[PDB]
RNA sequence: AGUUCUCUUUUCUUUGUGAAGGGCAGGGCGCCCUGGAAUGGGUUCGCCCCGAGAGAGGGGCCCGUGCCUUGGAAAGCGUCGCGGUUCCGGCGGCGUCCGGUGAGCUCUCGCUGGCCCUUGAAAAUCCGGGGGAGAGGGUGUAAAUCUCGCGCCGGGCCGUACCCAUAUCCGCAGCAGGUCUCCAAGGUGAACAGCCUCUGGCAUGUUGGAACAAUGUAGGUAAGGGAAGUCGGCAAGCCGGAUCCGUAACUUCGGGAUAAGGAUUGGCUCUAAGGGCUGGCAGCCGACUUAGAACUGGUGCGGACCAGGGGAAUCCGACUGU
RNA sequence: CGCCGUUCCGAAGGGACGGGCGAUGGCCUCCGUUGCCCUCAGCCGAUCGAAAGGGAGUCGGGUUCAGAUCCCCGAAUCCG
C-alpha cells in the first residue's frame, strides 16, 4: 500500500537493489562458474511474503 | 456532469469525512472539507433544555 | 510512428477525453517528436492537434414532446405506469390545499373581512376538509358575511 | 431603443464571387419579424446597404446571430460555406473570411 | 486581506516598517492601491481618479512601487 | 484554431489511397539558423579570397 | 460549430471566482420588555402552544456553506488576431450576459415527531463560571496587568509513484470465482427497473479463414387436439402495468385481497377544474396534473421494455428468523 | 521456563503558588538560577491499543515523461 512502515520500505528498496542481472565481466573472471543471476524475482511469478 | 473526487486518502464517509461544493476561479468544482458543527455551552442549572447566548458556537 | 505519448499528452493539455484527441493524419512525423506539454502545446496553436466537438445529443425531440404532453398528449390511460399516488401523491396535493386555504383566511382576517372568530371557525373547517378550493371557500365566506351583515341590521 | 448590426462582404465582393444587391433582397424577404418574413414587421426592422456593408436596424429586439444563421443558410445556398467564413469582428458586425488553405 | 477605507490609513499603513512594495491596479471604474505588508495585502480603493494621482504622489519614498497591466 | 480544419485535413489524408508508396512525410514544406546576412558576410571572407589574390597578382604583373 | 435539396430567428457546445476577514440576506431560538386573553385564541402536512403569560407590538442572540466586497482580473476560460529561437505562465481585441421554475435528484443545515423490557463510547484536549489568597501607584517619568491591533522567530521525524481488478490483490495463471468505499447526465418510466443516448472509456474478452451435415448448448414458432406424456404438469406456457367497477368461504376481526370476475388503454383537436404577485375587481406571471368530449386508423393502442395464472382441499410447522 | 492478576495483601507524590535560610552569577542598579527547610497536594494506577472513532491549522492558479492541497506564483492560517 502507500501506507508504509519505514522498515517495510527499506526492506523492499534492499529486494529492488538485489534484483538485476550480473555484470558481464564476472563471466571472464578465471575461475568463474556463474553464468546468470539464479535468484531474479518477479513480482508478479513470486511474492514476497511480506 | 463533472464527477468528484475526495482530495485525501479517507474514501469513507465517516463523520470527519465532510465535504462542501465548491465552485473555484478555474471554474470547476471540487470539495472542499467542512469543519464539524460547533455547540454553544449548555447551561449549567441542568434543568434549561436550551443552550445559552452570547457564546460562540 | 506510435503516438501513445502524444494521444495521452494532448488529451491532457486540452482537459478533454482521448477519444477528442484528434492528431493530423498528414503530419505523424512532425508529431511523432513532440515528447513534451511544451512541444504539445505549440502543435495546439499550429493546428496539428485539435479537440474534436462534443457528439450532437439534441433535445429538440424531447422538448417537442414536452409541449406535446403540456397541452394533455401522450397522458391518456394507456400511458400509465405508476399509481395515481405514485404519479401524484395526496399528501403532497392536501399539504399544497392546506396551505393555500389557510393564506386566504390569513389575508382575509389581517384585511379585516373576516374577524379572528370567523377565522378560527373556518379553520378548523378547511381542516375538515369542507371546502374544495378557493373559490368554494371564497364563495361560503361571502354567504356569511351576508348573513351576519342582516342579524347586524335586524338587531 | 434602437438595434444595429452590419455584414462586411467586403474580401468576397471585391473577388467578384458574390452580390450585396442580391444578399440585400435575400434579407429582404428573409428576416422574420414575429415569425413573418413578408413586411419586416411593417418597416420596423429597417435595412440598409452600403457599398459593401450592409446594415439592417430594428425598433424591437433583433438577435445578431439570426443574421449570421440567415448569412450562412446564404451561403450555403450559392454553395460558398467551403471557402468563406462568417466571423464577428465586434460586438456589432460579422464579417466574411476565406479559410486559411495554402 | 484587508481593505482600507480612508486615505489617513493607508498612508498609515504604507509607512510601516514591514511593507514591502505598492501596485497600482488601474481599472474601468476604480484605481486600487495594494501595499504588501507583513500579514495582510491592504487595498484602498478610490472612485476619484484625480486623487488616484494626488495619493500616488504622496507615497513614501523608500517603499517601492509598481504599477500593474 | 479553425475548427474545419480537422475535415479539411481528414479529407486531405483520405486522399492517400492513390499515392500509397510514395505519400509526402509532411504537408507543411514551409529555415537556415545561419541568417542569411551572416551567410553572405562569411562567403566574403572565404570565396573572395582565392579571387582577390589572384587580383592582387594581377596587381604585381603590370 | 453542425444542418440547410425543402423547412428550421434552428440544433450542439460554452458562458468563473478559493480560503480567511468585513457587510448584508436567509434560517433558527424552550431569549428579553410592554400587556393581559372565553364570544378562547394562535397554528402545522401532522402537530402542538398559552394566566407557570396567548395573540399583537418592540428588541436580543446563534448559524449565515447564500449574496456583495477585499481577495480579483493581474488569474482561468471562450473566441478572433499577431509575433518569436520559434519547447515563450508570449503579446493583443472582444466576451465571460439577463431572467424563470420544480413532491425533481444529490449533499447539507434546521424544526418537529415516532420506536425501544434496545436508550445508542471513553479519553486526550480546550473553555466559562464561583471564590478572593494576593499584586499593583500614589496623582505620575504612573504601576501591576491585558484572551485587543500590529510586528519578530520557528515547526523536526516517517508515508506519498502506480494498480485497486473480466491483466498490477487472493484463488499455482492475464482464472466467468472472491475482495471495503466515494461521485453519478438526457429520454421513457413510479423508479438507483429494463431499453436508447451524451461526458469518459473499450475493441468482443488467450486466435483467425471457409462452410451451414448429423448430435448438441441457448433461443423461437407450430395446424387439429389439449396432460392422452411422465412417478409427478418436470419444462414451457398462460396471467401481468395503470384506471374504473367488483370481490366469497373462513377469520385470531387485523386479514383473506392484486381474492375470484369484468371493462378500458393509441393518435389528434378541444373543453373544464385545480395557483402566485402588484394595485367579490383589474392586470401581469406559472406548474404540472385530473376529468370530460369530438374526430380518427385494416380493433390497433401497458404495441418494445417492464410486468402475479387462478380456484377447492388434505398433512406439517403458528408467523418473521436459522 | 514462568503463570494469575490490573487496584487487588503497596511507605505507589520526585511536583507547586507562596514563605524563610544560604550559594552563585548577569543587560551586577537588583533580578534570575540554584540548595535546603516550611507550607500545599486524591486521583487510585506503568505502558500499549484505531492510516474508517476523538484530534488546532491551506486554499486558488500554473507547472512534469512520470510528483504535486507537498514544487513555483499568489493569498492565508494554527501551534509554540
Ligand atoms: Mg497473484
Ligand atoms: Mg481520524
Ligand atoms: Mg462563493
Ligand atoms: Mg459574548
Ligand atoms: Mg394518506
Ligand atoms: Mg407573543
Ligand atoms: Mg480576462
Ligand atoms: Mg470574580
Ligand atoms: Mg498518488
Ligand atoms: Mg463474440
Ligand atoms: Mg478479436
Ligand atoms: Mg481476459
Ligand atoms: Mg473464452
Ligand atoms: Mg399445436
Ligand atoms: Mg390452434
Ligand atoms: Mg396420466
Ligand atoms: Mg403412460
Ligand atoms: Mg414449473
Ligand atoms: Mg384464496
Ligand atoms: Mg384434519
Ligand atoms: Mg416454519
Ligand atoms: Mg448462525
Ligand atoms: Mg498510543
Ligand atoms: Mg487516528
Ligand atoms: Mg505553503
Ligand atoms: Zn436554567
Same mark, same amino acid.
Given at each position: 500500500?502507500?501506507?508504509?512502515?519505514?522498515?517495510?520500505?527499506?526492506?523492499?528498496?534492499?529486494?529492488?537493489?538485489?534484483?538485476?542481472?550480473?555484470?558481464?565481466?564476472?563471466?571472464?573472471?578465471?575461475?568463474?562458474?556463474?553464468?546468470?543471476?539464479?535468484?531474479?524475482?518477479?513480482?508478479?511469478?513470486?511474492?514476497?511474503?511480506? | 456532469?463533472?464527477?468528484?473526487?475526495?482530495?485525501?486518502?479517507?474514501?469513507?464517509?465517516?463523520?470527519?469525512?465532510?465535504?462542501?461544493?465548491?465552485?473555484?476561479?478555474?471554474?470547476?468544482?471540487?470539495?472542499?472539507?467542512?469543519?464539524?458543527?460547533?455547540?454553544?455551552?449548555?447551561?449549567?442549572?441542568?434543568?434549561?433544555?436550551?443552550?445559552?447566548?452570547?457564546?460562540?458556537? | 510512428?506510435?503516438?501513445?505519448?502524444?494521444?495521452?499528452? =494532448?488529451?491532457?493539455?486540452?482537459?478533454?477525453?482521448?477519444?477528442?484527441?484528434?492528431?493530423?493524419?498528414?503530419?505523424?512525423?512532425?508529431?511523432?517528436? =513532440?515528447?513534451?506539454?511544451?512541444?504539445?502545446?505549440?502543435?495546439?496553436?499550429?493546428?496539428?492537434?485539435?479537440?474534436?466537438?462534443?457528439?450532437?445529443?439534441?433535445?429538440?425531440?424531447?422538448?417537442?414532446?414536452?409541449?406535446?404532453?403540456?397541452?394533455?398528449?401522450?397522458?391518456?390511460?394507456?400511458?400509465?405506469?405508476?399509481?395515481?399516488?405514485?404519479?401524484?401523491?395526496?399528501?403532497?396535493?392536501?399539504?399544497?390545499?392546506?396551505?393555500?386555504?389557510?393564506?386566504?383566511?390569513?389575508?382575509?382576517?389581517?384585511?379585516?373581512?373576516?374577524?379572528?372568530?370567523?377565522?378560527?371557525?373556518?379553520?378548523?373547517?378547511?381542516?375538515?376538509?369542507?371546502?374544495?378550493?378557493?373559490?368554494?371557500?371564497?364563495?361560503?365566506?361571502?354567504?356569511?358575511? =351576508?348573513?351576519?351583515?342582516?342579524?347586524?341590521?335586524?338587531? | 431603443?434602437?438595434?444595429?448590426?452590419?455584414?462586411?462582404?467586403?474580401?468576397?465582393?471585391?473577388?467578384?464571387?458574390?452580390?450585396?444587391?442580391?444578399?440585400?433582397?435575400?434579407?429582404?424577404?428573409?428576416?422574420?419579424?414575429?415569425?413573418?418574413?413578408?413586411?419586416?414587421?411593417?418597416?420596423?426592422?429597417?435595412?440598409?446597404?452600403?457599398?459593401?456593408?450592409?446594415?439592417?436596424?430594428?425598433?424591437?429586439?433583433?438577435?445578431?446571430?439570426?443574421?449570421?444563421?440567415?448569412?450562412?443558410?446564404?451561403?450555403?445556398?450559392?454553395?460558398?460555406?467551403?471557402?468563406?467564413?462568417?466571423?464577428?469582428?465586434?460586438?456589432?458586425?460579422?464579417?466574411?473570411?476565406?479559410?486559411?488553405?495554402? | 486581506?484587508?481593505?482600507?477605507?480612508?486615505?489617513?490609513?493607508?498612508?498609515?499603513?504604507?509607512?510601516?516598517?514591514?511593507?514591502?512594495?505598492?501596485?497600482?491596479?488601474?481599472?474601468?471604474?476604480?484605481?486600487?492601491?495594494?501595499?504588501?505588508?507583513?500579514?495582510?495585502?491592504?487595498?484602498?480603493?478610490?472612485?476619484?481618479?484625480?486623487?488616484?494621482?494626488?495619493?500616488?504622489?504622496?507615497?513614501?519614498?523608500?517603499?517601492?512601487?509598481?504599477?500593474?497591466? | 484554431?479553425?475548427?474545419?480544419?480537422?475535415?479539411?485535413?481528414?479529407?486531405?489524408?483520405?486522399?492517400?489511397?492513390?499515392?500509397?508508396?510514395?505519400?509526402?512525410?509532411?504537408?507543411?514544406?514551409?529555415?537556415?539558423?545561419?541568417?542569411?546576412?551572416?551567410?553572405?558576410?562569411?562567403?566574403?571572407?572565404?570565396?573572395?579570397?582565392?579571387?582577390?589574390?589572384?587580383?592582387?597578382?594581377?596587381?604585381?604583373?603590370?
Amino acid at each position: 500500500s502507500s501506507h508504509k512502515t519505514f522498515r517495510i520500505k527499506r526492506f523492499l528498496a534492499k529486494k529492488q537493489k538485489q534484483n538485476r542481472p550480473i555484470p558481464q565481466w564476472i563471466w571472464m573472471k578465471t575461475g568463474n562458474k556463474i553464468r546468470y543471476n539464479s535468484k531474479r524475482r518477479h513480482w508478479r511469478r513470486t511474492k514476497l511474503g511480506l | 456532469v463533472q464527477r468528484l473526487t475526495y482530495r485525501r486518502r479517507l474514501s469513507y464517509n465517516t463523520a470527519s469525512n465532510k465535504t462542501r461544493l465548491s465552485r473555484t476561479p478555474g471554474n470547476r468544482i471540487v470539495y472542499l472539507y467542512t469543519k464539524k458543527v460547533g455547540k454553544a455551552p449548555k447551561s449549567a442549572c441542568g434543568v434549561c433544555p436550551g443552550r445559552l447566548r452570547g457564546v460562540r458556537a | 510512428s506510435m503516438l501513445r505519448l502524444q494521444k495521452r499528452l =494532448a488529451s491532457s493539455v486540452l482537459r478533454c477525453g482521448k477519444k477528442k484527441v484528434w492528431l493530423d493524419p498528414n503530419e505523424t512525423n512532425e508529431i511523432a517528436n =513532440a515528447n513534451s506539454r511544451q512541444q504539445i502545446r505549440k502543435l495546439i496553436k499550429d493546428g496539428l492537434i485539435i479537440r474534436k466537438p462534443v457528439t450532437v445529443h439534441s433535445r429538440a425531440r424531447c422538448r417537442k414532446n414536452t409541449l406535446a404532453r403540456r397541452k394533455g398528449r401522450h397522458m391518456g390511460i394507456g400511458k400509465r405506469k405508476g399509481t395515481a399516488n405514485a404519479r401524484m401523491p395526496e399528501k403532497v396535493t392536501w399539504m399544497r390545499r392546506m396551505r393555500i386555504l389557510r393564506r386566504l383566511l390569513r389575508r382575509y382576517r389581517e384585511s379585516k373581512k373576516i374577524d379572528r372568530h370567523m377565522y378560527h371557525s373556518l379553520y378548523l373547517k378547511v381542516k375538515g376538509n369542507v371546502f374544495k378550493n378557493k373559490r368554494i371557500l371564497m364563495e361560503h365566506i361571502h354567504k356569511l358575511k =351576508a348573513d351576519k351583515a342582516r342579524k347586524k341590521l335586524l338587531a | 431603443q434602437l438595434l444595429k448590426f452590419t455584414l462586411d462582404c467586403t474580401h468576397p465582393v471585391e473577388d467578384g464571387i458574390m452580390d450585396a444587391a442580391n444578399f440585400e433582397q435575400f434579407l429582404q424577404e428573409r428576416i422574420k419579424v414575429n415569425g413573418k418574413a413578408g413586411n419586416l414587421g411593417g418597416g420596423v426592422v429597417s435595412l440598409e446597404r452600403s457599398k459593401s456593408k450592409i446594415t439592417v436596424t430594428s425598433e424591437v429586439p433583433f438577435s445578431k446571430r439570426y443574421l449570421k444563421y440567415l448569412t450562412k443558410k446564404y451561403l450555403k445556398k450559392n454553395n460558398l460555406r467551403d471557402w468563406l467564413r462568417v466571423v464577428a469582428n465586434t460586438k456589432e458586425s460579422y464579417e466574411l473570411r476565406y479559410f486559411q488553405i495554402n | 486581506p484587508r481593505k482600507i477605507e480612508e486615505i489617513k490609513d493607508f498612508l498609515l499603513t504604507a509607512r510601516r516598517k514591514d511593507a514591502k512594495s505598492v501596485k497600482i491596479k488601474k481599472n474601468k471604474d476604480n484605481v486600487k492601491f495594494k501595499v504588501r505588508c507583513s500579514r495582510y495585502l491592504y487595498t484602498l480603493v478610490i472612485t476619484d481618479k484625480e486623487k488616484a494621482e494626488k495619493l500616488k504622489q504622496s507615497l513614501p519614498p523608500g517603499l517601492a512601487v509598481k504599477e500593474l497591466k | 484554431v479553425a475548427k474545419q480544419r480537422i475535415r479539411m485535413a481528414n479529407e486531405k489524408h483520405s486522399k492517400n489511397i492513390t499515392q500509397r508508396g510514395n505519400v509526402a512525410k509532411t504537408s507543411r514544406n514551409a529555415k537556415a539558423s545561419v541568417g542569411p546576412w551572416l551567410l553572405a558576410l562569411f562567403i566574403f571572407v572565404v570565396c573572395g579570397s582565392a579571387i582577390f589574390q589572384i587580383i592582387q597578382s594581377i596587381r604585381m604583373g603590370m
